[PDB]
Short mmCIF file of C-alpha atoms in Angstrom, two decimals:
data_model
loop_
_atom_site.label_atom_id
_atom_site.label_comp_id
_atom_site.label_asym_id
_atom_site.label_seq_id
_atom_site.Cartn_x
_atom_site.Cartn_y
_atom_site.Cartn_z
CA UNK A 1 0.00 0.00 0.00
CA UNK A 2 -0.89 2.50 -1.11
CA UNK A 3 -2.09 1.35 -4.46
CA UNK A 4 -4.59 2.92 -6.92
CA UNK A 5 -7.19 0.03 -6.46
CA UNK A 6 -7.26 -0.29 -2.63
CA UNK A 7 -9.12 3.12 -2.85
CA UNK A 8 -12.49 2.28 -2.25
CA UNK A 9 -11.54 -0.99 0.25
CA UNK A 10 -13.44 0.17 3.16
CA UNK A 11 -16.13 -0.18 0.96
CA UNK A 12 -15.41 -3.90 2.00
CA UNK A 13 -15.06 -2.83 5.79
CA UNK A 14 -16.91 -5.68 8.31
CA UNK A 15 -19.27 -3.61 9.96
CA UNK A 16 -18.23 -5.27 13.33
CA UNK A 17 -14.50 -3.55 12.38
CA UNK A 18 -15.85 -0.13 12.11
CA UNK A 19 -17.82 -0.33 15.34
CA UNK A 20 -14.70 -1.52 16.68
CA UNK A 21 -12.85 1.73 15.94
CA UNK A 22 -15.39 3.78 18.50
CA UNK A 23 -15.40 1.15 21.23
CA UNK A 24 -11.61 -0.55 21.50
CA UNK B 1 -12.81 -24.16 13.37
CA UNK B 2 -9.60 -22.52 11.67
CA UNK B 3 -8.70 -26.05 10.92
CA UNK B 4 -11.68 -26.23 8.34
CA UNK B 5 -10.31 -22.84 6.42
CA UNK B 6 -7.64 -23.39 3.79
CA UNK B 7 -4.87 -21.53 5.69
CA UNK B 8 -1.98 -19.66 3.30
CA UNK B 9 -4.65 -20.36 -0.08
CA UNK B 10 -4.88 -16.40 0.08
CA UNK B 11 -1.29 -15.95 -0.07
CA UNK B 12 -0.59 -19.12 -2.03
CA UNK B 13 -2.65 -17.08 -5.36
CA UNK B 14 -1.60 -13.72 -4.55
CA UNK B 15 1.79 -14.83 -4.71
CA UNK B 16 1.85 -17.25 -7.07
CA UNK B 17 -1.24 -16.58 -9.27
CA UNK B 18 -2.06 -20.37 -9.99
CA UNK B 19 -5.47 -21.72 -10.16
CA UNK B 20 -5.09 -25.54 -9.48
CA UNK B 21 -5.91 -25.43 -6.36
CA UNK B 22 -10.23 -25.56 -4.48
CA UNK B 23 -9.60 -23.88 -1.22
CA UNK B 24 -12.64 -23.63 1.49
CA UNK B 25 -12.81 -19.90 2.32
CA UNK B 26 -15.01 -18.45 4.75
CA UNK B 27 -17.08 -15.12 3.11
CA UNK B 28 -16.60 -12.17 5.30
CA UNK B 29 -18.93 -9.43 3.22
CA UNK B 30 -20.19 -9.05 -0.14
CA UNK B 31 -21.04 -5.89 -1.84
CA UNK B 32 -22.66 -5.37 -5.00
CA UNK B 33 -21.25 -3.42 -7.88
CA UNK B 34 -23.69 -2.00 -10.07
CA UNK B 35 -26.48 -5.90 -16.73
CA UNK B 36 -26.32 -8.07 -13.58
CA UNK B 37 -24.69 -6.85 -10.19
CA UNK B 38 -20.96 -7.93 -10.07
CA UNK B 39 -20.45 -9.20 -6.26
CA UNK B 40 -17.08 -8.14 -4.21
CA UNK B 41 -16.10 -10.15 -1.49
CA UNK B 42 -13.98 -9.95 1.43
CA UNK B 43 -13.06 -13.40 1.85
CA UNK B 44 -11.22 -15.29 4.99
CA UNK B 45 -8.84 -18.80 4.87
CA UNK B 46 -8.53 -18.51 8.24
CA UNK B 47 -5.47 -16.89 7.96
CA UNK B 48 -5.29 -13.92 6.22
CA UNK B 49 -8.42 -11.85 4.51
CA UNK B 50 -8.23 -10.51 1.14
CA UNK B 51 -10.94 -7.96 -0.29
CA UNK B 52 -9.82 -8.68 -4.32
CA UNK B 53 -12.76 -11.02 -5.06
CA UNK B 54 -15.37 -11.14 -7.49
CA UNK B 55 -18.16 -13.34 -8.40
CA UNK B 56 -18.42 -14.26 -12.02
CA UNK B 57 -21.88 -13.61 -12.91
CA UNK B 58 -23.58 -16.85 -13.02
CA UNK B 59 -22.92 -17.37 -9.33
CA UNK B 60 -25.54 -14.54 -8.89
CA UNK B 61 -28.18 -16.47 -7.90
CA UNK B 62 -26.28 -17.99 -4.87
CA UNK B 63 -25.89 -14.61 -3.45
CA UNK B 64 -29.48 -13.91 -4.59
CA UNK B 65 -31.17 -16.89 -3.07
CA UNK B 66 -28.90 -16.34 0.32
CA UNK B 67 -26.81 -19.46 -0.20
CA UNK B 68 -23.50 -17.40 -0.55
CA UNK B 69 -23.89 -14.94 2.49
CA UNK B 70 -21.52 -13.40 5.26
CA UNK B 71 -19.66 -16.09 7.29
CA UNK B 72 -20.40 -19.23 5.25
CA UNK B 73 -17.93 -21.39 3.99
CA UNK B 74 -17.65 -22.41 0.42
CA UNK B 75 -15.21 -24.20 -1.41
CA UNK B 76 -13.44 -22.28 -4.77
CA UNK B 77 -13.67 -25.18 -7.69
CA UNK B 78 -12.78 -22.93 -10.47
CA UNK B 79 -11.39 -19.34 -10.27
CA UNK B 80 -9.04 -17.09 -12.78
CA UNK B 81 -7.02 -14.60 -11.46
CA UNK B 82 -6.10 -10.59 -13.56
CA UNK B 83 -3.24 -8.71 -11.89
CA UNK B 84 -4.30 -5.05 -11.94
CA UNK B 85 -1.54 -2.38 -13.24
CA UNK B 86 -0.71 -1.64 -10.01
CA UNK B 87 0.00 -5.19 -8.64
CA UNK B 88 -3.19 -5.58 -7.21
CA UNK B 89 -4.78 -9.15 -8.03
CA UNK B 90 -8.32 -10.10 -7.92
CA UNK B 91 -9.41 -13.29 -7.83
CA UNK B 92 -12.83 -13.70 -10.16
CA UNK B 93 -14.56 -17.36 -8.59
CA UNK B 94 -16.32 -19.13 -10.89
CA UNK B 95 -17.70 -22.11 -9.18
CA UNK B 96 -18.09 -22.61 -6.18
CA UNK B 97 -19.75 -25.16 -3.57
CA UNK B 98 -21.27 -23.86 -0.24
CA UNK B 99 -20.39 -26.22 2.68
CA UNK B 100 -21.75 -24.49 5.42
CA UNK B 101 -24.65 -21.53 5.84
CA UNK B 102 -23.84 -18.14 7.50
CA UNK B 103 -26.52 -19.57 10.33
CA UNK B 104 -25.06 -22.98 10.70
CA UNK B 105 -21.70 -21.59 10.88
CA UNK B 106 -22.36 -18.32 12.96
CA UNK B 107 -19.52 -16.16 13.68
CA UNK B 108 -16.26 -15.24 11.63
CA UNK B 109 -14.11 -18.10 12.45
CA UNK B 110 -10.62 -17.13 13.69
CA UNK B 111 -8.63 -14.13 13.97
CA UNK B 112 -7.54 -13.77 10.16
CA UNK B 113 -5.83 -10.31 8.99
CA UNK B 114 -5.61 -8.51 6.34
CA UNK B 115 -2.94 -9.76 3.64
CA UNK B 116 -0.15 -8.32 3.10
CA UNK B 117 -0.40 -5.86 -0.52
CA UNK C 1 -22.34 -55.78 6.28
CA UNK C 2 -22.25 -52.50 4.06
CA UNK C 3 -25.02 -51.36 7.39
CA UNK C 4 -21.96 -51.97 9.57
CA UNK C 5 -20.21 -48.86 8.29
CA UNK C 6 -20.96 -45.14 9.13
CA UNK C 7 -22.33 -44.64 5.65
CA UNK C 8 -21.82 -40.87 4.61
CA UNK C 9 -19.67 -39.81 7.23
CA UNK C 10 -16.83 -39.34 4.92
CA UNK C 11 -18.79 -37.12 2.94
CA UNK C 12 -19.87 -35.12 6.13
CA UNK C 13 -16.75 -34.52 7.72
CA UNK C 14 -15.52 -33.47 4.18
CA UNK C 15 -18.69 -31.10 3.63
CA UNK C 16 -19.17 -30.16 7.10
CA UNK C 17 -15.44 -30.51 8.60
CA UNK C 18 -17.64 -31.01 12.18
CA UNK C 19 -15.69 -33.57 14.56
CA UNK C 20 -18.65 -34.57 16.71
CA UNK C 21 -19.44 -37.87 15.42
CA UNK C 22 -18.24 -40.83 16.12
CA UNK C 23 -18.27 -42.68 12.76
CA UNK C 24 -17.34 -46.46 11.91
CA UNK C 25 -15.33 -47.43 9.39
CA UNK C 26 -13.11 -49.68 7.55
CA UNK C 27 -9.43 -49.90 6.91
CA UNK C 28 -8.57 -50.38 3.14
CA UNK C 29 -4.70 -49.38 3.67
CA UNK C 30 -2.41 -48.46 5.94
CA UNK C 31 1.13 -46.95 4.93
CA UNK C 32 3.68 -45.61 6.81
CA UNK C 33 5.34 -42.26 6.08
CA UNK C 34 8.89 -41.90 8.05
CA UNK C 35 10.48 -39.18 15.77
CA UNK C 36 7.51 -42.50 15.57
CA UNK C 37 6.49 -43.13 12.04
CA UNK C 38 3.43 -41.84 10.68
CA UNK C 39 0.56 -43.41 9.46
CA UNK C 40 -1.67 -42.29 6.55
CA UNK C 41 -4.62 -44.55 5.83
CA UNK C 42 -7.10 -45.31 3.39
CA UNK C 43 -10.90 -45.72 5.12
CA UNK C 44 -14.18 -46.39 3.87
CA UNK C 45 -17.27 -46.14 5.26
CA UNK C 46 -18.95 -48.25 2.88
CA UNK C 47 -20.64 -45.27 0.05
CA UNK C 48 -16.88 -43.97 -0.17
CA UNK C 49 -13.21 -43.80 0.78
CA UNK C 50 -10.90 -41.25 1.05
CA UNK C 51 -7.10 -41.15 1.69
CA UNK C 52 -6.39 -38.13 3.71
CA UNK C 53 -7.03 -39.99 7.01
CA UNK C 54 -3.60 -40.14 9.29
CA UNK C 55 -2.91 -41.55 12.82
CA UNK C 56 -2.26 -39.99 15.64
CA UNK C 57 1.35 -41.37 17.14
CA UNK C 58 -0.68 -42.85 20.46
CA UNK C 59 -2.13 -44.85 18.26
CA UNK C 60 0.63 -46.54 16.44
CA UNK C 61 0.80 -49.30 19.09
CA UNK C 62 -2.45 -50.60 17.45
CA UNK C 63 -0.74 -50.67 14.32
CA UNK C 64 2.35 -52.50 14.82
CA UNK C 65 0.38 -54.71 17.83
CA UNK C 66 -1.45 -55.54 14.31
CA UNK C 67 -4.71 -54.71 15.96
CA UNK C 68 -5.68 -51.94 13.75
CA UNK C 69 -4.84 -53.54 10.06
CA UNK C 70 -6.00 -53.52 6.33
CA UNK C 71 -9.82 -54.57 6.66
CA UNK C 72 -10.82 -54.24 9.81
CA UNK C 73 -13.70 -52.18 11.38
CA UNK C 74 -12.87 -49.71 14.03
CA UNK C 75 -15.24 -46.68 15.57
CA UNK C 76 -13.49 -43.21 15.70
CA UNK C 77 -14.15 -41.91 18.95
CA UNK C 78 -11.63 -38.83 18.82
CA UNK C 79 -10.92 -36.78 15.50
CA UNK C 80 -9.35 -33.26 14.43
CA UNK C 81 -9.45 -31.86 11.02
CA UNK C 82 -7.04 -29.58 9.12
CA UNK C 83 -7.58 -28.39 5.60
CA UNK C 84 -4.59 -27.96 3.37
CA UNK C 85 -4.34 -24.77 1.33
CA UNK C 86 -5.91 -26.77 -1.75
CA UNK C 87 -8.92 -27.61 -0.26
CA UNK C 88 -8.39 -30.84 0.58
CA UNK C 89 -9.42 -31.99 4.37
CA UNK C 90 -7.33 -34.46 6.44
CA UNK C 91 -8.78 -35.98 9.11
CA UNK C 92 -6.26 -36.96 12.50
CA UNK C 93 -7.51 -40.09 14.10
CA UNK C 94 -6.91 -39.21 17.95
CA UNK C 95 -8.75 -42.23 19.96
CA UNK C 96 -10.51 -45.31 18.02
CA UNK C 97 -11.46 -48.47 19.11
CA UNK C 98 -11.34 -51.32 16.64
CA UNK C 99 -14.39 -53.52 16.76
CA UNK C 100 -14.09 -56.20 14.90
CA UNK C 101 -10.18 -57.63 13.40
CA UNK C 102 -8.79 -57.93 9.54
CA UNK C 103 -9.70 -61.93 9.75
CA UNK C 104 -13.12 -61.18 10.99
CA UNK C 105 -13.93 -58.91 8.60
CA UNK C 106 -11.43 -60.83 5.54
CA UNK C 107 -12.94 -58.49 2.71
CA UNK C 108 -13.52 -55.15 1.81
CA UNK C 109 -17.24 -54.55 3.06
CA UNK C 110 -19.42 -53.53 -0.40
CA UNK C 111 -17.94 -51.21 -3.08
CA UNK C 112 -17.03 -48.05 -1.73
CA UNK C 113 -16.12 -45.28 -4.48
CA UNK C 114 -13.38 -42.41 -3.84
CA UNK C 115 -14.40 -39.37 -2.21
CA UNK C 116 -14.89 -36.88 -5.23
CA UNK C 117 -12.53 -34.32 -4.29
CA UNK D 1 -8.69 -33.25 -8.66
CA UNK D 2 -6.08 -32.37 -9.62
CA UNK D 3 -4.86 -30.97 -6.08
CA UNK D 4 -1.08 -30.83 -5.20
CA UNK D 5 -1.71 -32.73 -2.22
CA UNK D 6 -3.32 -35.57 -4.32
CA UNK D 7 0.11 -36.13 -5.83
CA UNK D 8 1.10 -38.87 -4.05
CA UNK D 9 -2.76 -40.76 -3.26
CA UNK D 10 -1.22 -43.88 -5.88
CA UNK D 11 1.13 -44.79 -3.11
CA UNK D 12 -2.25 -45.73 -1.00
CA UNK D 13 -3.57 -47.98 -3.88
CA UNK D 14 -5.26 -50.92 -2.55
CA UNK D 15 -3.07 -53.88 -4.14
CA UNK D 16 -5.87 -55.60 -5.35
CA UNK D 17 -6.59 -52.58 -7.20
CA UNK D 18 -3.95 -51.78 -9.12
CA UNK D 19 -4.00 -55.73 -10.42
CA UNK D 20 -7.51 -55.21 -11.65
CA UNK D 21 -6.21 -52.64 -13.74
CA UNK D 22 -4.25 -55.67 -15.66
CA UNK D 23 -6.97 -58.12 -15.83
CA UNK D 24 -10.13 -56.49 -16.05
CA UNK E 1 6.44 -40.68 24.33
CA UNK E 2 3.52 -41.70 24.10
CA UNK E 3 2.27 -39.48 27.23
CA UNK E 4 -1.50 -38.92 27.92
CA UNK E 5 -0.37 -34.76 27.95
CA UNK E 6 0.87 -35.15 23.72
CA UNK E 7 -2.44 -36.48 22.98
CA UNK E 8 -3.43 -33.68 21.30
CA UNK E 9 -0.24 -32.06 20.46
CA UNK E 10 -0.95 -32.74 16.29
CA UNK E 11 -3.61 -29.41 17.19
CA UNK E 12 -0.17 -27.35 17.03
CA UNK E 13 0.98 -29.29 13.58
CA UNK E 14 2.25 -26.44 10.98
CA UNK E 15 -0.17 -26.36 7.92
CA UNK E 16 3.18 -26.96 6.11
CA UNK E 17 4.13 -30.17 8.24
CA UNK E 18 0.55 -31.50 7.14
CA UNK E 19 1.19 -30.44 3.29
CA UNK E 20 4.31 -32.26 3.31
CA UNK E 21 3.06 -35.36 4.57
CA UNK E 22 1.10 -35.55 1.08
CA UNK E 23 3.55 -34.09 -1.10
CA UNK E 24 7.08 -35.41 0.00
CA UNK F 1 20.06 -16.62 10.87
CA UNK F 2 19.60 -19.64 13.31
CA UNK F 3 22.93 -18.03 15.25
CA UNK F 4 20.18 -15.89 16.09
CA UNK F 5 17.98 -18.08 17.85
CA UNK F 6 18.94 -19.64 21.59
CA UNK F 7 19.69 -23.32 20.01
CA UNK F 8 20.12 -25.73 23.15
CA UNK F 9 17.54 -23.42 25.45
CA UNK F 10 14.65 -25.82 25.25
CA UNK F 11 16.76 -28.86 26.07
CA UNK F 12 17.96 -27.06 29.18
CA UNK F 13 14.29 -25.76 30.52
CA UNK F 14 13.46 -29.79 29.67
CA UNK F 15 16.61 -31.40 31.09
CA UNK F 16 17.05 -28.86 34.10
CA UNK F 17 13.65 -26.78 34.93
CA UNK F 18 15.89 -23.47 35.46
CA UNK F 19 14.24 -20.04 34.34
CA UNK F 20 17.15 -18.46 34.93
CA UNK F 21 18.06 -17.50 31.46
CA UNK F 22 16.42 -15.31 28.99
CA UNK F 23 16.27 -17.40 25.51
CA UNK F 24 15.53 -16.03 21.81
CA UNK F 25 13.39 -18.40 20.05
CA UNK F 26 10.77 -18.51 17.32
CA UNK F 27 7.17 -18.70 17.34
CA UNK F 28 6.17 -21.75 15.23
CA UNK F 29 2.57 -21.70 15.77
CA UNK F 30 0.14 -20.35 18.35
CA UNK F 31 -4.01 -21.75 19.10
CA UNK F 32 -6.00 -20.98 21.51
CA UNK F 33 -7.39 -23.17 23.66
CA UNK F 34 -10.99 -21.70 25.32
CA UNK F 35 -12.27 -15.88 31.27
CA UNK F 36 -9.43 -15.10 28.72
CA UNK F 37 -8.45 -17.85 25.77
CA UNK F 38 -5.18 -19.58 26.57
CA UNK F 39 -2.71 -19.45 23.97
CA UNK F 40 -0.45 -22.82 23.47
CA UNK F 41 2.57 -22.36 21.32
CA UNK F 42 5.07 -24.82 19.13
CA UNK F 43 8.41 -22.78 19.85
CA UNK F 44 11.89 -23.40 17.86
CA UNK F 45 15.02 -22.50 19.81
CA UNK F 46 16.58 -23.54 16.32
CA UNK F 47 17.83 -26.70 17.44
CA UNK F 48 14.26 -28.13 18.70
CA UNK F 49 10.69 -27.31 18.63
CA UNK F 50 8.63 -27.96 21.43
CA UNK F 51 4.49 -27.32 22.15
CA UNK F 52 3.92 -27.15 25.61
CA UNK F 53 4.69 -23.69 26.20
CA UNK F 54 1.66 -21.63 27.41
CA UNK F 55 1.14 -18.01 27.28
CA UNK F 56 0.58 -15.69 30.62
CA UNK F 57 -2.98 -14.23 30.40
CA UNK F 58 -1.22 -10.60 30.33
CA UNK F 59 0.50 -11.42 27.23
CA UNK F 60 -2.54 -12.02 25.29
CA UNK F 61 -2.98 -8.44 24.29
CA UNK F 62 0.47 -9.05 22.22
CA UNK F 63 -1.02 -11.70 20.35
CA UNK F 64 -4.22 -10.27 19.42
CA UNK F 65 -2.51 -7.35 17.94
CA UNK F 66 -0.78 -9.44 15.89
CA UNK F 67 3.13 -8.88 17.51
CA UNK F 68 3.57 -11.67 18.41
CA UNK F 69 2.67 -14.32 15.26
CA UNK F 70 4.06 -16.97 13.24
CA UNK F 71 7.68 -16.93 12.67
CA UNK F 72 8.43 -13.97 14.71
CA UNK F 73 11.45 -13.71 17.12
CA UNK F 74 10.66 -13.05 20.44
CA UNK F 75 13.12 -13.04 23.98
CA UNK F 76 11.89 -14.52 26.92
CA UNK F 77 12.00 -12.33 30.30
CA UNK F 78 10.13 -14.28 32.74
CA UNK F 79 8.77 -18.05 32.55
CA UNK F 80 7.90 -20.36 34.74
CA UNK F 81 7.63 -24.50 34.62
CA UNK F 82 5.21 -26.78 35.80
CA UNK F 83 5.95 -30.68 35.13
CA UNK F 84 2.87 -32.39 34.66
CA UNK F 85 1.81 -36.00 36.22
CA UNK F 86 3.35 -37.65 33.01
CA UNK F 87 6.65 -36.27 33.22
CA UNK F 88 6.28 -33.29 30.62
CA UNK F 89 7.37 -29.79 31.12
CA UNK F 90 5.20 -27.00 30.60
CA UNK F 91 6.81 -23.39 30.20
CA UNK F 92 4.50 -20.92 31.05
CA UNK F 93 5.87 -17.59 29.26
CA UNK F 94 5.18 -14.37 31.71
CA UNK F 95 7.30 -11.54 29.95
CA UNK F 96 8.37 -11.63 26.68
CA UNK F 97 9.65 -9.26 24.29
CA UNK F 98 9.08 -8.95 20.41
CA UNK F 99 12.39 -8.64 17.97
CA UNK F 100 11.60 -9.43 14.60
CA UNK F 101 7.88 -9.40 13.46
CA UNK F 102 6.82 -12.12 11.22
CA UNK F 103 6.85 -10.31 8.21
CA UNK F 104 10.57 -8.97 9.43
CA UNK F 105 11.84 -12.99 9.42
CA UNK F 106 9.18 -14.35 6.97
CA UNK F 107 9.80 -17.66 7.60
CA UNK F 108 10.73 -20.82 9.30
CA UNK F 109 14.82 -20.54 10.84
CA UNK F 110 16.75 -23.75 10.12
CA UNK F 111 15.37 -27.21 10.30
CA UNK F 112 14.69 -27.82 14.12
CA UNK F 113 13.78 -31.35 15.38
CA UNK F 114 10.83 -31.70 18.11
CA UNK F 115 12.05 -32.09 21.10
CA UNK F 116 12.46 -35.86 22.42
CA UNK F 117 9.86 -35.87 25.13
#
């Protein structure tokens, strides 16, 4: 990283992992 | 669990790009691209996740009829792989078996993180 | 005699990968690969066999006891799997029991076909 | 099939089977 | 060996050691 | 590279029990076995490998965010043994340092033997 096509990845994001960001 | 995931399949293609291999993955998420949807996936061996997956379109109606869902596990019979410009490669499946249903199965299994690009 | 074997169980733990049954089976083969040797073994539970079966080391003594030999029927009472990176499942036999010996038994039990892997 | 780790499943050949191929 | 405590100790194989029962 | 590992360590803790000493070695693998999981590792002093090393509940943190992994290098500060019923050792690691991350060494060092329990 970072590469052109990992640009929209957290399109991909487990919604567990972002909900993990405001709690951990 | 772990032990029914194909451990090191993700890095086995994305480092050498060969396609003779059916490894049981575990799907993570899907997320439809908008002719018919193409499906991303964010897909788990156990090991390491990778989010460079797409569903040729004749798989479809697995997504469709909620066989292929988050956290089953399927196993890969026939894929192709495209290396992007950039080094990037995605891995298109197209066949694939389900083994297990998201319900029967649960939870994501393991610990896996994110491979290595 | 074919209704002494755990018909299907090979395909379930293959499907499935789930370790909480207790099939019976037959032995077709048993080879060693060379700390103890280690035994790989071809089993059949009547509908198929499959090759990727392998011994635990506790269990050797049945082996070279000749207890556990080519056509006997034994239950699996303790089992792990591990799938390889190219989707194929082996199955460790932890604790067994055989139930009936090789002389017994003196043939394979109906016409089991491979596993299609 | 074919698998790598099916490379070597000929050595587990039941004896009996491999004659058949000869005679049948 | 064998001790009762190693009974499970093929949990803690490598994935590799596995492969190369099959391969080598 | 396997001058940088503590070759002869686990043979010591196994032969003598001492915890005096402070020994690089190499993760091999870790699982967890199910209050906090329990994390059971196959370490590799380079000479030997040997699974019955457990890790501290305070150390768990270490593996979760993925420092301490497969084929990292870590140094051991603080262990202590327990010799079970049967006669094996297990080395219970209570401070431990990362040196090398797995991706750092990215991959097995040398050709160590398990040890001869």
């Amino acid at each position: 990283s970072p590469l052109p096509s990992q640009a929209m990845d957290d399109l991909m994001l487990s919604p567990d992992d972002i909900e993990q960001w405001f709690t951990e | 669990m772990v032990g029914q995931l194909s451990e090191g399949a993700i890095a086995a293609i994305m480092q050498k790009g060969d396609t003779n291999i059916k490894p049981i993955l575990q799907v993570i998420n899907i997320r439809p691209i908008t002719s018919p949807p193409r499906y991303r996936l964010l897909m788990s061996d156990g090991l390491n996740t990778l989010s460079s997956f797409m569903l040729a379109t004749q798989l479809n109606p697995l997504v469709e009829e909620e066989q292929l869902s988050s956290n089953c596990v399927c196993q890969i019979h026939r894929f192709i792989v495209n290396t992007l410009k950039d080094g990037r490669r995605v891995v298109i499946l197209m066949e694939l078996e389900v083994l297990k249903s998201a319900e029967a199965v649960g939870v994501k299994i393991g610990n896996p993180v994110p491979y290595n690009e």
